[PDB]
Write a protein that binds this DNA or RNA. Structure first.
Length: 1188
RNA sequence: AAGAUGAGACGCGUUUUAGAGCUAGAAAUAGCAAGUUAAAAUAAGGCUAGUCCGUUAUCAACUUGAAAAAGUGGCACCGAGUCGGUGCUU
DNA sequence: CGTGATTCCAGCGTCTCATCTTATACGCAGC
DNA sequence: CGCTGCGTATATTGGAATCACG
């Protein structure tokens, strides 16, 4: 048997594989070909590449799922509101809700009157006259006190609930506090009263302009400070301003506090932080802060709301109505001005829905920005146009009610408006008064981000824990959903498990047990050297306890000097002691211990072991939750041990982060023979003081065996890796390709497996060698480990894996240098063979390296310089112009095996690179994704429209188009051809769309009979996924891009000379070498027309693009006078014409050639279909012309 | 510092319908109006009936296994336009 | 009256939170 | 030995429509 090696090159969209025997020669083997064709054996080289579409992140799918949930919940909220309105609306208007529901149907299909709101034309007209927009209805309901019809109330409430704005501001906003300057003046006055010693000159400073400017918070703060030379941005007044702006000021400095007084108004915890300020400095500032809070409100209302507050308590409705009136006035003025001045453009602006005029801005498709762009030169051309220009410069001209920039509106405004409306109308409708709280809750309720979807055990994203078997409505959310359990699971389901105990769960970062473990583990390897000691000795358990009590339990940090003085000098009376294993200070510290000692003020409580679990239940509680209410609820169980002040301090205290070792791995498991745990051993390990690594790697202790036993699917193992989904797909395809290759070579595993991943998108000499050899990226290490585990499964009796297969890792830079140094150039656009070529080179390089320098295996699985690939060079430069020669045959001195034959290896490499047949295979994959193009098309008399619902005929209501076909199906059956319904046998591809895929797979016979096919041969059905391969004739092979489109599937085996000439001429990436290359470029410029001739021949044989090829030839003849480099680059562009895959347009100089599309699939019905294996070696050819 | 994964939310957009378009012109076609908004859906859909799930990952062919997956393909040499030819076994 | 050429077009803009993970250095400890 | 950890620092391509057009 011939032992071989496998080279692999992974990439986002390609996986190159190569099999090399000795002398670095790709074998050529005959493979049997199945099918009903006539061939029985085909020759194939053992090198190739696999092509596939890059993997997609779940980001888009997650966004779509979230949108689905949001729409579902919105509809549920509407349903709740209607249910509240059910009986009363039925008393008032029996079918009002029904008219609301069928509003989308056309008049033919409506079961009620076409007017939803009133069910009659006259009332609808009158209503539309009275309230031009819904905001008029809202303003009327808020302001008027007269009893209103329940339908209008429902419409206003539904408009509020359905569109409620964001929840980025919590608490009460007090929208009446809209005084941008008066509140500022009041705050300044209060500050001056509290700081009469340091008054502030607020005169001459416009608070409104600075604070309501459409700029960043920092910029406006700096602008305000600039007008106050005596005050700074970091000053107390400056920090109050920053807090009003929504920043995070640090009051610790201004108030000289030890606690970091970080306060932000938006945060729910703000009030509690204010309470902290109510416990350190005093209450005199409270009103001050309140004023600042009020100031903040005005700022938040400044940009969103531009209206007087005294006129009404619904500022949003007033602002919308004012904007509508401004729009109306500007529209009337603009119409008058256009008719007076430019009557010709009047039709273009007020009638052309296709243009970007007002007709297109309203009725057609045109944004506000687009409309402004269209209209601005028109307004400048006209005269008497100043107000409109000012508004356009302000982006406040002809604005609509429902614009894109309404997302800044806090839900508090809607809540206040709804509350006001309910209060106004509660005197007329008892149920509104009774269910006011319910509607307020519906408006203000959210599913908390830490609860997750309210599933019932049917979801792969859900962790919500219930309490009772009922329906989670917003009014009984707390009664049903267990907030504590759900919030704990929301953290636990995504936390890393212990590496040594995969079933167990890691401990928090600041656990007292974890800190103790770190302290003891660091203390175990501590040695002390004194005069009376011959040899340094480890610290005894009693000594360790004494040190911890003296230092670790008394100071937030422990230093080397503190250890030397406070223990050896004080207790041991050691005046000279040296400590090894630690420098500077000690990284481990009892930060949690000192913090809890500060808070609860009971050292004995901490020192009691019986409290340990409780202590853990505190720290975990201080890590699981971020809401202070949840933390308080959890700590209420332990509120009996500590005073309310301690409870408040604990609620304030909240640290995050998680450790890396579980509790069972520290204090859970106990050694069988000794009866001691890991913590027990760390507290007393005799005199050896074995640390955690020694304890877990000790063959004499049960811990290692327990770890091994507890430590006991390729796809799942890959899905848990860290990397982009495309790279993970590439890794999986690489592994399956390795499996296929092993099956190919007679099930004899290769000696070496070199792996290189392209890209995401004396001691010094030894270090440089290590840098050039090791692969810094860890995903490469993961892939190498996976391949080593899969290929190697022979662990000897000494508990060591027999390395029958050596996984090597290599970096792209070395191979690229090899290519560019030995003129083994590549062009990305010519063809895909480079992928396989790269793999081959990788294998060769790797193999040669492991042959030449076996001792370096540990670096990636001798000389005086740091170079490692230099021995391939036939001639070596000594960096001083002293060109010398290496031995012609390079061999390892110790072994004596020949590792490089310059007289044969270079020629063999050239031949392998020049081999015309390369196993390029496009990974056939059933396509999935959106059912079609999402854009909803208007009703047309076309059959390509796709229904958006069951009863919505696309001829009337419009719908989707351009469906995506997953895989085609070749059907041989009969149809009712002609008027006589003659059953003519037919053979054509039928497109299986993603929408219809399930129906077809459930019952193909009925699905095919539904589309008009009769007498279907069930066994003759052949499934052709996307990129299925067909051979028509004369070697013309095409990939089935869809049910009705083909792709070029043949590659151009360009001679290496042409490739090198193209690389050198175009400057794709030693002056004498450059001059020689230029001379060769000119010499092959004499040959340049040969490249064009080869392109034309390949196009005639396989492409059949007559018009495009003729235009290419004409343009080339026209541009023959162009410089050689320009022509070379343009021909590199020309390579797009014949490159594999979907045809693409290109540009030869100034002539643009569009893509030729093979839109007919009639020919492949009589061609030979090919099933290429994963590596493409095992091929199954079926002659489709023998069917039918 | 960067990137990935998941959860909770907003604002649009896009379609059909509701916004009586008026005058004259046999009709077609011109002139004159208005235009800002609202409802429903926003993947068809499924049952596992939940404020659940539906665009990520997986997938050559034949047999088996629900399916994850398992089984299924001789070697050497010469050359190379997509792989051919020659010798042994079969 | 089908058929090759030519052209048009595709849902999108934010916010909050959590879990991470890498990415590379440094120091300590090791079986 | 190489790993094991502990800590610190931060556009594209298929569909679809239309247009000569023999």
């Amino acid at each position: 048997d011939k032992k071989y090696s496998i080279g692999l090159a992974i990439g986002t969209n390609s996986v190159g594989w190569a099999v090399i025997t000795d002398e670095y020669k790709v074998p050529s083997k005959k493979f049997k070909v199945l099918g009903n064709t006539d061939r029985h054996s085909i020759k194939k080289n053992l090198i190739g590449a696999l092509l596939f579409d890059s993997g997609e992140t779940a980001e888009a799918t997650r966004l779509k799922r979230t949108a689905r949930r949001r729409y579902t919940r919105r509809k549920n909220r509407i349903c709740y509101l209607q249910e509240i309105f059910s009986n009363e609306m039925a008393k008032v208007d029996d079918s009002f809700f029904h008219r609301l529901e069928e509003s989308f149907l056309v008049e033919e299909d409506k079961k009620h009157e076409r007017h939803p709101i009133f069910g009659n034309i006259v009332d609808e007209v009158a209503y539309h006259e009275k309230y031009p927009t819904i905001y008029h209805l809202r303003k009327k309901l808020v302001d008027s006190t007269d009893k209103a019809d329940l339908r209008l109330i429902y419409l206003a409430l539904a408009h509020m609930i359905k569109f409620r704005g964001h929840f980025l501001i919590e608490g009460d906003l007090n929208p009446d506090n809209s005084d941008v300057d008066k509140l500022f003046i009041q705050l300044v006055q209060t500050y001056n009263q509290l700081f009469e010693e340091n008054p502030i000159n607020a005169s001459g400073v416009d608070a409104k302009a600075i604070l309501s400017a459409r700029l960043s918070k920092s910029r406006r703060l700096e602008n305000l400070i600039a007008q106050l030379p005596g005050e700074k941005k970091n000053g107390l007044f400056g920090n109050l301003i920053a807090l009003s702006l929504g920043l995070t000021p640090n009051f610790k400095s201004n108030f000289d506090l030890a606690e970091d007084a970080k306060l932000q108004l938006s945060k729910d915890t703000y009030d509690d932080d204010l309470d902290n300020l109510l416990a350190q400095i005093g209450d005199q500032y409270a009103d001050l802060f309140l004023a600042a809070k009020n100031l903040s409100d005005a700022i938040l209302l400044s940009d969103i709301l531009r209206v007087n507050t005294e006129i009404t308590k619904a500022p949003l409705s007033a602002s919308m109505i004012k904007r509508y009136d401004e729009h109306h006035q500007d529209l009337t003025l603009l119409k008058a001005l256009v008719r007076q001045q430019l009557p010709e453009k009047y039709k273009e602006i007020f009638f052309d829905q296709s243009k970007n005029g007002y007709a297109g801005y309203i009725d057609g498709g045109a944004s506000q920005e687009e409309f402004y762009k269209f209209i601005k030169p028109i307004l400048e051309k006209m005269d008497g146009t100043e107000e409109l220009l000012v508004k356009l410069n302000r982006e406040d001209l002809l604005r609509k009610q429902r614009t894109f920039d309404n997302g800044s509106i806090p839900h508090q405004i809607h809540l206040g408006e709804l509350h006001a409306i309910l209060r106004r109308q509660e005197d007329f409708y008892p149920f509104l008064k009774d269910n006011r709280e319910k509607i307020e809750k519906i408006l203000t309720f959210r599913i908390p981000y830490y609860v997750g979807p309210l599933a019932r055990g049917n979801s792969r994203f859900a962790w919500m824990t219930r309490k009772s078997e009922e329906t989670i409505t917003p009014w009984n959310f707390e009664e049903v959903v267990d907030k504590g359990a759900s919030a704990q699971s929301f953290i636990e389901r995504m936390t890393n498990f212990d590496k040594n105990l995969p079933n167990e769960k890691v401990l928090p970062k600041h656990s007292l047990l974890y800190e103790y473990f770190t302290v003891y583990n660091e203390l175990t390897k501590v040695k002390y050297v004194t005069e009376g000691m011959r040899k340094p000795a480890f610290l005894s358990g009693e000594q360790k306890k004494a040190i911890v009590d003296l230092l670790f339990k008394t100071n937030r940090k422990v230093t080397v000097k503190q250890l030397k003085e406070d223990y050896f000098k004080k207790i041991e009376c050691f005046d000279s002691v040296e400590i090894s294993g630690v420098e500077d200070r000690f990284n481990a510290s009892l930060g949690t211990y000192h913090d809890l000692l500060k808070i609860i003020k009971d050292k004995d409580f901490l020192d009691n072991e019986e409290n340990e679990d409780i202590l853990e239940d505190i720290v975990l509680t201080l890590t699981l939750f971020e809401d202070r209410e949840m933390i308080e609820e959890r700590l209420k169980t332990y509120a009996h041990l500590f005073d309310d002040k301690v409870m408040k301090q604990l609620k304030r205290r909240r640290y995050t982060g998680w450790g890396r070792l579980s509790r069972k791995l520290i204090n859970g498991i106990r050694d069988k023979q000794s009866g001691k745990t890991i913590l027990d051993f760390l507290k007393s390990d005799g005199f050896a003081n074995r640390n955690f690594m020694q304890l877990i790697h000790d063959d004499s202790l049960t811990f290692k065996e327990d770890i091994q036993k507890a430590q006991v699917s390729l796809h799942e193992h890959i899905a848990n890796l860290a990397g982009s989904p495309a790279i993970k797909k590439g890794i999986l395809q690489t592994v399956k390709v390795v499996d296929e290759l092993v099956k190919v070579m007679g099930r004899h595993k290769p000696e070496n497996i070199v792996i290189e991943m392209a890209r995401e998108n004396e001691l010094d000499k030894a270090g440089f060698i290590k840098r050039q050899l090791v692969e810094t990226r860890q995903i490469t290490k993961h892939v190498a480990q996976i391949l080593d585990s899969r290929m190697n499964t022979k662990y000897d009796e000494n508990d060591k894996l027999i390395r029958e297969v050596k996984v090597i890792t290599l970096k792209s830079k070395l191979v690229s240098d090899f290519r560019k140094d030995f003129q083994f150039y590549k062009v990305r656009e010519i063809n895909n063979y480079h992928h396989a070529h790269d793999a081959y080179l990788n294998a060769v390089v790797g193999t040669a390296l492991i042959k030449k320098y076996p001792k370096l295996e540990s670096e990636f699985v001798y000389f005086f310089y740091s170079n490692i690939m230099n021995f391939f060079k036939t001639e070596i430069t000594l960096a001083n112009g002293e060109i010398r020669k290496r031995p012609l045959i390079e061999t390892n001195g110790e072994t004596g095996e020949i590792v490089w034959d310059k007289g044969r290896d270079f020629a063999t490499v050239r031949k392998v690179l020049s081999m015309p047949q390369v196993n390029i295979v496009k990974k056939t994959e059933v396509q999935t994704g959106g059912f079609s193009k999402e854009s909803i098309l208007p009703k047309r008399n076309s059959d390509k429209l796709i229904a958006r619902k069951k009863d919505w005929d696309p001829k009337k209501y419009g719908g989707f188009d351009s469906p995506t076909v997953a895989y085609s199906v070749l059907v041989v059956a009969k149809v009712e051809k002609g008027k006589s319904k003659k059953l003519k046998s037919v053979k054509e591809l039928l497109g299986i769309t993603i929408m219809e895929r399930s129906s077809f797979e459930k019952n193909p016979i009925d699905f095919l009979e539904a589309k008009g096919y009769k007498e279907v041969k069930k066994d003759l059905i052949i499934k052709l996924p996307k990129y299925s391969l067909f051979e028509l004739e004369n070697g013309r092979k095409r990939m089935l891009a869809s049910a009705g489109e083909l792709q070029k599937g043949n590659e151009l085996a360009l001679p290496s000379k042409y490739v090198n000439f193209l690389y050198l001429a175009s400057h794709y990436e030693s002056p004498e070498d450059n001059e020689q290359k230029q001379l060769f470029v000119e010499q092959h410029k004499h040959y340049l027309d040969e490249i064009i001739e080869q392109i034309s021949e390949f196009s005639k044989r396989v492409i059949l693009a007559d018009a495009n090829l003729d235009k290419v030839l004409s343009a080339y003849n026209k541009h023959r006078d162009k410089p050689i480099r320009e022509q070379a680059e343009n021909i590199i562009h020309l390579f797009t014409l014949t490159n594999l895959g979907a045809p693409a347009a290109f540009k030869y100089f100034d002539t643009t050639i569009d893509r030729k599309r093979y839109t007919s699939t009639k020919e492949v019905l009589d061609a030979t279909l090919i099933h290429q294996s994963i590596t493409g070696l095992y091929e199954t050819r079926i002659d489709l012309s023998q069917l039918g």
